[PDB]
Amino acid sequence: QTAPPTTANLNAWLNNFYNAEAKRKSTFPSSLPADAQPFELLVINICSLSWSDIEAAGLMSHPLWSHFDIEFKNFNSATSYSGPAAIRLLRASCGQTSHTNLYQPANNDCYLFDNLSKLGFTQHLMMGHNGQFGGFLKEVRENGGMQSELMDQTNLPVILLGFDGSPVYDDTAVLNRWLDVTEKDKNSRSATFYNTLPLHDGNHYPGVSKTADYKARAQKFFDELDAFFTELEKSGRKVMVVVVPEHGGALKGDRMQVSGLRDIPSPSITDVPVGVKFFGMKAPHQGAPIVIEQPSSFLAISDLVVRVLDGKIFTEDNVDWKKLTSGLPQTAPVSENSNAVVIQYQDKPYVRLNGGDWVPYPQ
Ligand SMILES: [Mg+2]
Ligand SMILES: [Zn+2]
């Protein structure tokens, strides 16, 4: 990023970014080693949660945030819409593509959960909703490659209704069912993709008309997730949980995009907290979370999963935490929706709307 920030130079930079990203892959082994230790992977993909939202709600000190072993502080969601965010996470094992290329085929080895299934992990798909709104489940299947049947939702308590009137299931009940389904799946190892949207602004209680209280809803969700973590620790089960918000809820707006709007994938909307917690270790992590400050995105999640595949971390007495958390792949914070791109160039944000000229994102 030495050339002057003209439209031609920024377009050239972005196209070079795509070309460099296309050469990046998170490489999985052909088989697990003979002494591999089984564990469960659970990826919790959450709608409408960014660092900016947590600060706006006054919840930066909720115990959940210190209940991780690794925390990414500059993770970029690369989009501000749910469907694209889920596709990008499901395609975590290859470098970042343009928005248009999310809807074109990718190499089979780009699909994180297929890479895990090929190594003997049972794949599970679980949702706190039915995925009909916005064609979300359809995109997860067609572009995210996720063909697993939806985990049974029958008899789960319903906390709210979504904007379209369909159920929003209670996260505590969903997660407790996950414990049971994984116990009963005949496999010692599994990988689950869980998408949940309790903070979505259109969720409501039928007949009430009260405006949603984001802080109260976020407090309840964080309380439920933290309680699930505490119970999972006491269970002795070997689990890797990755908490990955899709994108922010846009609680705080700015000069160019007012609060609530997500058409432009602004830095505050795409800068999301990503946390990893390990359960059932012989030597559980003791301090505050290890912080990864470098610019990161989904490729770093895939590479961390590769590093843990053999399960040795769960039986090691002296874990080299630095080895585990160092040298992960870095990714520039480029974000796209269908007709908007945001980049950082010479430490300043720029935006391109409708394929026109680049303009500074006003600050
Ligand atoms: Mg099992
Ligand atoms: Zn979403």
Q: Which of 35, 166, 40, 25 is nearest to 96 (CA)?
A: 25
Q: Nearest ligand, CA of residue 248?
A: 2
Q: Which of 350, 303, 297 is nearest to 84 (CA)?
A: 297
Contacts of 102 (CB under 8 A, 6+ apart): 84, 87, 88, 91, 143
Cross-strand pairs, 353: 340
Distance of alpha carbon 59 from alpha carbon 223, whole angstroms? 11
CB 90 within 8 A of CB 111: yes
Distance of alpha carbon 126 from alpha carbon 232, whole angstroms? 18
Cross-strand pairs, 348: 345
Contacts of 251 (CB under 8 A, 6+ apart): 52, 53, 56, 57, 214, 259, 260
Q: How many CB atoms lie within 10 A of CB 132?
A: 12
What's the CA-to-centroid distance between 50 and ligand 2, angstroms?
11
Distances (CA, A) of 183 to 82, 91, 142, 176, 351: 30, 27, 29, 11, 47
CB 86 within 8 A of CB 243: no
Distance of alpha carbon 335 from alpha carbon 351, whole angstroms? 10
What's the CA-to-centroid distance between 182 and ligand 2, angstroms?
26
Distance of alpha carbon 322 from alpha carbon 300, whole angstroms? 15
What's the CA-to-centroid distance between 257 and ligand 2, angstroms?
18
What's the CA-to-centroid distance between 37 and ligand 1, angstroms?
13
| Token pair 């990503």: residue | 274
What's the CA-to-centroid distance between 135 and ligand 2, angstroms?
12
The bridge status of strand 167-169 relative to strand 158-161 is: antiparallel
What's the CA-to-centroid distance between 187 and ligand 1, angstroms?
4
What's the CA-to-centroid distance between 218 and ligand 2, angstroms?
15
Per-residue burial over 89-101, b if 16 or more Cβ lie within 10 Å, else e, is bbbbbbbbbbbeb
CB 245 within 8 A of CB 321: no
Q: Nearest ligand, CA of residue 39?
A: 1
Q: Nearest ligand, CA of residue 50?
A: 2
What's the CA-to-centroid distance between 48 and ligand 2, angstroms?
6
Q: Nearest ligand, CA of residue 269?
A: 2
Method used to obtain the model = X-ray
What's the CA-to-centroid distance between 35 and ligand 2, angstroms?
39
CB 199 within 8 A of CB 48: yes
What's the burial of 6, exposed, middle or buried (CB within 10 Å: 0-12/13-18/19+)? exposed
Angle between helix 298-308 and 82-90 (nearest 10): 30
What's the CA-to-centroid distance between 303 and ligand 2, angstroms?
24
What's the CA-to-centroid distance between 247 and ligand 2, angstroms?
6
Which amino acid type is present at position 40?
Answer: E
What's the CA-to-centroid distance between 3 and ligand 2, angstroms?
35
Kindly calculate the radius of gyration of the chain based on its CA atoms and give it in whole angstroms: 20
Contacts of 315 (CB under 8 A, 6+ apart): 37, 282
Contacts of 273 (CB under 8 A, 6+ apart): 49, 50, 51, 54, 65, 71, 72, 73, 75, 243, 245
What's the CA-to-centroid distance between 348 and ligand 1, angstroms?
47
What's the CA-to-centroid distance between 345 and ligand 2, angstroms?
27
CB 299 within 8 A of CB 22: no
Which amino acid type is present at position 121?
Answer: F
Contacts of 212 (CB under 8 A, 6+ apart): 201, 203, 204
Q: Nearest ligand, CA of residue 77?
A: 2
What's the CA-to-centroid distance between 251 and ligand 2, angstroms?
13
Distance of alpha carbon 107 from alpha carbon 104, whole angstroms? 10
**∠285-286-292 over CA atoms, to 5°?**
65
What's the CA-to-centroid distance between 298 and ligand 1, angstroms?
26
Cross-strand pairs, 76: 271
Contacts of 207 (CB under 8 A, 6+ apart): none
Q: Nearest ligand, CA of residue 190?
A: 1
* Per-residue 3-state assignment (H helix, E strand, C coil) for the chain: CCCCCCHHHHHHHHHHHHHHHCCCECCCCCCCCCCCCCCEEEEEEECCCCHHHHHHCCCCCCHHHHCCCEEEEEEECCCCCHHHHHHHHHCCCECCCCCHHHHCCCCHHHCHHHHHHCCCCEEEEEECCCCCHHHHHHHHHHCCCCCCCECCCCCCCEEEECCCCCEEECHHHHHHHHHHHHHCCCCCCEEEEEEECCCCCCCECCCCCCCCCHHHHHHHHHHHHHHHHHHHHHHCCCEEEEEEECCCCCCCCCCCCCCCCCCCCCHHHHEEEEEEEEECCCCCCCCCCEEECCCECHHHHHHHHHHHCCCHHHCCCCCCHHHHHCCCCCCCCCEEECCEEEEEECCEEEEEECCCCEEECCC
What's the CA-to-centroid distance between 39 and ligand 1, angstroms?
9
Q: Nearest ligand, CA of residue 183?
A: 1
What's the CA-to-centroid distance between 47 and ligand 1, angstroms?
27
- CB-proximal residues (5 Å) to ion ligand 2: 47, 82, 246
Resolution stated for this PDB structure, in Å: 1.4
Distances (CA, A) of 362 to 41, 61, 77: 40, 30, 20
- Full set of structural domains in the chain with CATH: 7-360 (3.40.720.10)
Distance of alpha carbon 68 from alpha carbon 285, whole angstroms? 9
The bridge status of strand 40-46 relative to strand 239-245 is: parallel
What's the CA-to-centroid distance between 354 and ligand 1, angstroms?
47
Which amino acid type is present at position 13?
Answer: W
Q: How many CB atoms lie within 10 A of CB 235?
A: 12
Which amino acid type is present at position 264?
Answer: I
Q: Which of 13, 113, 50, 72 is nearest to 271 (CA)?
A: 50
